[PDB]
């Protein structure tokens, strides 16, 4: 089973740059490698094939090289649209495999998140369920560690979160984490904390509220 390993996982560049993505096979595949580009909610678009043959229609800034087990995709002039995720794959032997993919995101200066904590509504509490929400607004880069703390007790497994797609104006990312507890469970405590750790922070920032206290 041949394994295709790309690199990097996330490439953060700026328009105009000359980006270069790598893809390493675990076995010889001669030149039976092909690169595809993919945007959210769209089907993969074949870019290169034969390790270097630019598929009919692909822009010329796209070029691919390599042979054997070392391959590399190249964009000489990253355009405002070439921002997406790129996949490499081999069709040498069976079974056909693809690389994990490389996200080419837009670069910009670091910017810490703007944090907000939201206690569960009374309305929802009536139904015996409590949802605590923590908002990390427009931060960059995308790596962010969020940790819930009830009566300063670390939580685990009762929280989910979703991240927006890199914004189209300030190229930032917004995250939203939710701590789901039961009415009683929730009322069985006072302080609810949301500790956010991000590169743009000298030290982890916490945002909390207390059951009751306005």
């Amino acid at each position: 089973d041949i394994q295709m390993t790309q690199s990097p996982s996330t490439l953060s560049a700026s328009v105009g740059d000359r980006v270069t993505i790598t893809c390493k096979a675990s076995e010889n595949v001669d030149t039976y490698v092909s690169w595809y580009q993919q945007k959210p909610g769209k089907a993969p678009k074949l870019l290169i094939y034969g390790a270097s043959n630019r598929y009919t229609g692909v822009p010329s800034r796209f070029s691919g090289s390599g042979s054997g087990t070392d391959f590399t995709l190249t964009i000489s002039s990253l355009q405002p649209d070439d921002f997406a995720t790129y996949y490499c794959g081999q069709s040498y032997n069976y079974p056909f495999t693809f690389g994990q993919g490389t996200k080419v995101e837009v670069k910009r200066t670091v910017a810490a998140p703007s944090v907000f904590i939201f206690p569960p509504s009374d309305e929802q509490l009536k139904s015996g369920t409590a949802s605590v929400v923590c908002l990390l607004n427009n931060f960059y880069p995308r790596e962010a560690k969020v940790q819930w703390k009830v009566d300063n007790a670390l939580q685990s497994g009762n929280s989910q979160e979703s991240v927006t797609e890199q914004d189209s104006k300030d190229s930032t990312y917004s995250l939203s984490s939710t701590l789901t507890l039961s009415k009683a469970d929730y009322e069985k405590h006072k302080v609810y904390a949301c500790e956010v750790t991000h590169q743009g922070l000298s030290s982890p920032v916490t945002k909390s509220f207390n059951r009751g206290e306005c």
């Binding site: 092909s34 993969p44 034969g50 069709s91 069976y94 079974p95 908002l135 306005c214």
Partner: protein
Amino acid sequence: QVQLVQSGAELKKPGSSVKVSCKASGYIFTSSWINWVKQAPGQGLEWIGRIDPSDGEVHYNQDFKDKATLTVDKSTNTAYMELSSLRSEDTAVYYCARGFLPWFADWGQGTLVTVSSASTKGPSVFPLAPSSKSTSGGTAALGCLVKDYFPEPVTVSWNSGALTSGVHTFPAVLQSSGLYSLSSVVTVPSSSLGTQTYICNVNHKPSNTKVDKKVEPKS
């Protein structure tokens, strides 16, 4: 113009089989293989198998050996992929690519197979009210919590589109309950809180739902 058109999205209960299709136009159906790749949500491309429309010859990725079944109708230029014992792990997007042999030249738009036993449930909307009375902060974050709904998707607007700047409607998460849930927030001036009305307009067509929930400062 080459063209591969796949069937409409499917929603299936655990244990059920399904038969997704792919119709080609724009070339010689029986001269190219028809491949099938699976891509779960936020995941990469996993190859399932390949089939020669010319005679039905088929080669499957041993991993889908017991899961996928590629058949093909050369008269109607369509390839089929029947999945059995559908489970959560089967929830993904299935693509049909055509290869001028080793390469996947033309892909289908894909089919979204969503496996869940949950039934159509309209959402419960809850406010994400702003909390703080200071001089250090100028912006106040408020929003709505569209919760426990199914299936996707839920459209959300603020003050009927009169508000768009600063808005942030995150991607829905699929809860353990099997039901969906998402949150929407918009950062706005503390000052406006007492002069401007903020309302999120949540609609879930599946359940024929429409709700406007005025989110105000919880003083």
